[PDB]
């Protein structure tokens, strides 16, 4: 009932742990719980829609309100209607939400499978034995670019080389 | 490194036949903590 809505909400809270930083989506959800509970407390608070026109009207002997307010209550059974044009325009907002949701969904789905392919590609091609440094130059001309820039610079020390391939020095 | 590290360790090391006295053991042991402070702001009671 109300619990279906709220179970999906709180599931979304522990999902929202993974995507936290929507600070008024969560306030809106807290509100949706609030106002859902407000209508729930309203509808559970709900008195009868009329007087006990049988007993408690036959209680009052005097006749000036017992026909009057009975007929007035039965008159005012018209008590006006609910909005339902708000579920069209809020539904427009839901459409926008859905559009964006699907775009995001599709984007991350593509990326997920891209990452699967990428992992396999790193697995099926990536030396770990020998491999010519020329092949590394061929696959990364970044190698030669930095080298040429260093040769041009008059540098022959790469900074960090020593920090993970310590110098052999006997001095 | 430092002298008080030498003396400290020397006291720790000498208790490492085995036999020893209560005054000795106190002169060579401590079970304690220390709260440095700065601000209030303190790093927690860490073994002294």
């Amino acid at each position: 009932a109300k619990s279906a809505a709220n179970k999906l909400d709180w599931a979304k809270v522990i999902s929202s742990l993974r995507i936290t930083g929507s600070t008024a989506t969560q306030l809106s959800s807290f509100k949706k719980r609030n106002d859902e509970a407000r209508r729930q407390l309203l509808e559970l608070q709900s008195q009868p829609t009329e007087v006990d026109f049988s007993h408690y009207r036959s209680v009052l002997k005097n006749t000036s309100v017992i026909d009057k307010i009975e007929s007035y209550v039965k008159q005012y059974k018209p008590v006006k209607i609910d909005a339902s044009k708000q579920l069209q325009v809020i539904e427009s907002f839901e459409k926008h939400a859905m559009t964006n949701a699907k775009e995001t969904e599709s984007l991350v789905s593509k990326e997920l499978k891209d990452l699967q392919s990428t992992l396999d590609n790193i697995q099926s091609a990536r030396p770990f034995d020998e491999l010519t440094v020329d092949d590394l130059t061929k696959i990364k001309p970044e190698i030669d670019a930095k080298v040429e820039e260093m040769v041009k610079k008059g540098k022959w020390d790469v900074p960090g080389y020593k920090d993970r391939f310590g110098n052999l020095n006997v001095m | 490194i430092s002298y008080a590290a030498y003396l400290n360790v020397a006291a720790q090391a000498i208790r490492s036949t085995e036999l020893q006295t209560a005054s000795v053991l106190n002169r060579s042991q401590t079970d304690a903590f220390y709260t440095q402070y700065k601000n209030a702001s303190e790093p927690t009671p860490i073994t002294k």
Partner: protein
């Protein structure tokens, strides 16, 4: 009622009287251990001092303080806190190492910026070299202690096994040792890093002495407070005893009247 609440309050005071008696006596016992260490320690220190006098080595600053984690030692904690406060006019911002919880709160209140190091777990232990040594080793890095051209320690000098006086003294520091007017009536190598060694040794040897002095005065204070407590409990015992006795008589009188009234009818 009245009678029972009087009697119970008188009993409370009695139980307290017993506790304060017990504590005062125990204080004498605990105090003895503090002193026992302190004599031998002071004798050891004195041999070093023989050198220091003849050497004429002389002498920011540190404030170090000594109290027990334990309470019910009297107003040693707060007389020392106060005598520290008096000397925390002499240095508003000086960096305080507080050995023991009871002074710690009070000084921490007076300035918290000042507090750089504080200890916890000493205040129940006898003064011993290991403790002093570890504190010393940590001290150079944290407080920059050797750097400071003074070090000063605050403690309670244990004049007698019935007293506590808050007292302070200055310990040698590595700058002081460096610039010392003499240390030439004894000789030692420049190829020995004697400032960094001797500072540390006398950092501990003097500090250990200060701790011993403080701890003994503190437990001595505990006896003083607990004795006055036993007395205070006696006075309240007497007041509620008199009340008890009168109240007891009144119940009898009221009952007696009831018996007479019944008999008369």
């Amino acid at each position: 009622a009245t009678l029972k609440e009087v009697e119970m309050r008188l009993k409370s005071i009695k139980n307290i009287e017993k506790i304060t008696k017990t504590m005062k006596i125990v204080a004498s016992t605990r105090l003895s251990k503090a002193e026992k260490a302190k004599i031998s320690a002071k004798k050891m220190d004195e041999a070093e001092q023989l050198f220091y006098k003849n050497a004429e080595t002389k002498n920011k600053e540190l404030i170090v303080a000594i109290t027990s984690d334990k309470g019910l030692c009297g107003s040693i904690h707060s007389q020392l806190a106060k005598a520290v406060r008096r000397h925390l006019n002499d240095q508003p911002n000086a960096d305080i190492v507080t050995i023991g919880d009871k002074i710690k709160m009070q000084l921490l209140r007076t300035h918290p910026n000042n507090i750089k190091l504080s200890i916890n777990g000493i205040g129940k232990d006898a003064p011993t070299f290991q403790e002093s040594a570890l504190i010393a080793d940590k001290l150079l890095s944290v407080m920059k202690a050797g750097t400071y051209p003074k070090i000063s320690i605050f403690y309670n000098d244990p004049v007698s096994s019935l007293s506590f006086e808050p007292s302070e003294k200055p310990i040698f520091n590595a700058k002081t040792i460096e610039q010392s007017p003499s240390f030439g009536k004894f000789e030692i190598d420049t190829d020995a890093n004697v400032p960094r060694d001797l500072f540390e040794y006398t950092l501990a040897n003097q500090m250990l002495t200060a701790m011993a002095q403080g701890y003994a005065a503190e437990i001595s204070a505990r006896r003083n407070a607990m004795d006055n407590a036993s007395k205070n409990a006696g006075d309240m015992i007497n007041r509620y005893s008199i009340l008890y006795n009168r109240t007891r008589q009144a119940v009898i009188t009221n009952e007696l009247v009831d018996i007479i009234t019944g008999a008369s009818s």
